[PDB]
Structure 1
Amino acid sequence: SMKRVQPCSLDPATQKLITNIFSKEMFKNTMALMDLDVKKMPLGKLSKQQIARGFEALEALEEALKDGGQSLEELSSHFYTVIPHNFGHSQPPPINSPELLQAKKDMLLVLADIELAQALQAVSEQEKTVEEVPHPLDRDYQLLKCQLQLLDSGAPEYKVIQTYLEQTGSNHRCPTLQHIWKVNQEGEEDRFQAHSKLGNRKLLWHGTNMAVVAAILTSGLRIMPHSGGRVGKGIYFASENSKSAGYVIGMKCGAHHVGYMFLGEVALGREHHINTDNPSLKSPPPGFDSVIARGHTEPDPTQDTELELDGQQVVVPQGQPVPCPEFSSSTFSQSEYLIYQESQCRLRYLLEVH
């Protein structure tokens, strides 16, 4: 009656990643870092319904912020009832600016991915009936339905990636490369095949929270109804690692600070360049396939190389950032690359950095 636990098939680096991205402590840390009350909102109690209600609560606040309706205090108080927060048992603050509204929308987006990782781990029926089970880390890896292949130092893309990291990361304290995995999330293949005629492909950084990595591996980079930011409702990338790194929180592990960053192949097609913030965008202007909020600098284009991925040439920057005189007055210090359809990105690499 005792089930056999089969030996783990994963290399140590992958075991570590799979431990990290499903870690209950990591998820709870992330909740504490977003001011959530983890005692009142434990991981096993998070539900899709709760999250839905929280978004409805924010929708009502958004309406008030743009009549005799409920005050921002009352409507905040509703939100906090739905999504418990911890501010050392003082009374949480009213959501009364566009900036704070987007911060709460972004918190719930993170929480939605935490809930997905929990839902994903639910033990199925066939699992209750089989007499042998995979090692927990094999099981968790398999749940992702995503192939990860750890690269070594002499993989053809390895030096190119390392160069992109080193040349466009922070000058004074560049993240240290630990591992690179090739990511093959199948069922990304077909939608991305759609844009095969679209030239102008670029390999671009997307940094995130450790708490959303499992979700990204299962489903790709996604746009939600409440997605937002300086260039509107799309998926954000950067050509400078240092820009994307600003979005990595990174978890203390022993004496190290561990973080994860993706590289996506983005079919940018015909680019629309802007130089001022537009949080209201929901697509490129007619006739364009992307929006690039152009920064004061860009990785030196004269140093761009290419990789061949699924038979397509994909541009990879290799240059240190240089000034772009035409965009010296831009509201953006560094470029943000936007797509507004999920099919225009395919995940290609995952990097662990310390």
Structure 2
Amino acid sequence: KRVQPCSLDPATQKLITNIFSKEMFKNTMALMDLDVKKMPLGKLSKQQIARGFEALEALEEALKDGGQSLEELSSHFYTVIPHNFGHSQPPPINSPELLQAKKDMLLVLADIELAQALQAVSEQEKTVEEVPHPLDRDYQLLKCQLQLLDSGAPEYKVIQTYLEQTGSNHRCPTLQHIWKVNQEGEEDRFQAHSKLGNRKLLWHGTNMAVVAAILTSGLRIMPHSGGRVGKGIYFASENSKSAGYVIGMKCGAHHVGYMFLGEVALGREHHINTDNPSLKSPPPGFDSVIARGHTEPDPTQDTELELDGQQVVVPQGQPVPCPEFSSSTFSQSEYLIYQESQCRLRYLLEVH
């Protein structure tokens, strides 16, 4: 069989290599204390991950009788999801904090399986005399359009300014590339909230392990997912806040990482200043919940982008003190929506 030449540019080739890298996945599983030998990448199954959540639920039930002890229930979760702790006795999941930690860990592992199941070779490919370059194939598996922007791009500078003004003044994240994300299947559903104004291009820092899944399914509100503002999709107006979630891998000397810029239909905003991990939707009449931080990218420096005939607000100024929320429980703002349809992936950034 002939292997057709790759039609991807260096940047997009590098990207597609990283986000499907089996070494990158194993690294992530190792960073989560998971036994990579007892749980090989090719062994990951939706069934196993489900059995894991079942164990987490029954354990959650025992945290809220004559049932099963926490020490005993925990021991079963580690039987289904093999952990690596230098061959010592694993920790008992006896706290709500540790409980959600394992849920978050399984959710990430769930997106690792999604990428694996996605790469599955179908019969259609096996009955063709010519195959695409491995990278083209992977790129096509995402069913998502990635157009690399340049310096001469209109929205490039807006994004670059947005990045440098809301990033950490010292540990500056270096912009390398910007991709225009056209996830096909996100426009149709996003046209629902086309009558809904108040749009803002917000940050979403993600670890490299779920980048493929996000490019394939978009930002999702998974079961067992949570946080300080409940069960929704988390965003940030400050790059620095999102970057704290960007877990990247080494590359010779640099620390590669990826961030998303999403067009969020905020509509009527319900402002809170206190953690509320029970939220599953905004209060009646509201379309989004916003955790106002002690600071906010100077609203007077906001600019607007024209995306698909829509005016989208894009912050451009440094964080300024917000006295009205000076004693808030959030240092930085956390934007929330509680239905996936309100988010539209717009740009993918590669930072160093």
Q: What band does the TM-score fall into relative to the shorter chain?
A: over 0.9
Deviation track 1:92-144 (CA, whole Å, cap 9, x = no partner) reads 10111111111100000000000000000000001111000000000000000
Once residues 41 and 110 of structure 2 are traced to their aligned partners in structure 1, the CA distance between those partners, rounded to angstroms, is: 11
State the SS of the aligned residue for 1:182.
strand
Q: Which residue number corresponds to residue 269 of structure 2?
A: 271
Once residues 169 and 144 of structure 2 are traced to their aligned partners in structure 1, the CA distance between those partners, rounded to angstroms, is: 34
Q: Which residue number corresponds to residue 344 of structure 1?
A: 342
State the SS of the aligned residue for 2:121.
coil
- Identity in percent: 100
Once residues 237 and 87 of structure 1 are traced to their aligned partners in structure 2, the CA distance between those partners, rounded to angstroms, is: 33
* 1:192 Cα deviation after fit: 0.5
Equivalences, count: 352
Matched, 1:115 2:113: yes
TM-score calculated relative to the size of structure 2: 1.00
State the SS of the aligned residue for 1:68.
coil
* 1:61 Cα deviation after fit: 0.9
Deviation track 1:134-172 (CA, whole Å, cap 9, x = no partner) reads 000000000000000000001000000000000000011
Once residues 352 and 225 of structure 1 are traced to their aligned partners in structure 2, the CA distance between those partners, rounded to angstroms, is: 29
State the SS of the aligned residue for 2:82.
coil
* 1:85 Cα deviation after fit: 0.5
Deviation track 1:246-273 (CA, whole Å, cap 9, x = no partner) reads 0011100111100000000000000000
Deviation track 1:192-234 (CA, whole Å, cap 9, x = no partner) reads 0000011000000000110000000000000011110000000
Once residues 84 and 278 of structure 2 are traced to their aligned partners in structure 1, the CA distance between those partners, rounded to angstroms, is: 31
Once residues 75 and 297 of structure 1 are traced to their aligned partners in structure 2, the CA distance between those partners, rounded to angstroms, is: 43
Once residues 344 and 130 of structure 1 are traced to their aligned partners in structure 2, the CA distance between those partners, rounded to angstroms, is: 40
Once residues 339 and 188 of structure 2 are traced to their aligned partners in structure 1, the CA distance between those partners, rounded to angstroms, is: 14
* 1:69 Cα deviation after fit: 1.2
* 1:173 Cα deviation after fit: 1.3
Once residues 256 and 92 of structure 1 are traced to their aligned partners in structure 2, the CA distance between those partners, rounded to angstroms, is: 34
Once residues 47 and 216 of structure 2 are traced to their aligned partners in structure 1, the CA distance between those partners, rounded to angstroms, is: 21
Q: Which residue number corresponds to residue 313 of structure 1?
A: 311
Deviation track 1:291-323 (CA, whole Å, cap 9, x = no partner) reads 001100000000000000011000000010001
Once residues 71 and 164 of structure 1 are traced to their aligned partners in structure 2, the CA distance between those partners, rounded to angstroms, is: 50
State the SS of the aligned residue for 2:154.
coil
Once residues 89 and 134 of structure 2 are traced to their aligned partners in structure 1, the CA distance between those partners, rounded to angstroms, is: 41
State the SS of the aligned residue for 1:65.
coil
The structure 2 residue matched to 1:159, chosen from 140, 157, 160, is 157
Q: Which residue number corresponds to residue 130 of structure 1?
A: 128
Matched, 1:190 2:188: yes
Once residues 330 and 65 of structure 1 are traced to their aligned partners in structure 2, the CA distance between those partners, rounded to angstroms, is: 29
Once residues 208 and 92 of structure 1 are traced to their aligned partners in structure 2, the CA distance between those partners, rounded to angstroms, is: 27
Runs of 4+ in 1 over 4 A off after TM superposition: none
Q: Which residue number corresponds to residue 30 of structure 2?
A: 32
Once residues 70 and 140 of structure 2 are traced to their aligned partners in structure 1, the CA distance between those partners, rounded to angstroms, is: 45
* 1:71 Cα deviation after fit: 0.8
Query: RMSD value over aligned CA atoms?
Result: 0.4
* 1:67 Cα deviation after fit: 1.3
Structure 2's unaligned 5+ residue stretches are none
* 1:238 Cα deviation after fit: 0.2
* 1:91 Cα deviation after fit: 1.2
Q: Which residue number corresponds to residue 98 of structure 2?
A: 100
Deviation track 1:7-38 (CA, whole Å, cap 9, x = no partner) reads 00000000000000000000000000011000
* 1:180 Cα deviation after fit: 0.1
TM-score calculated relative to the size of structure 1: 0.99
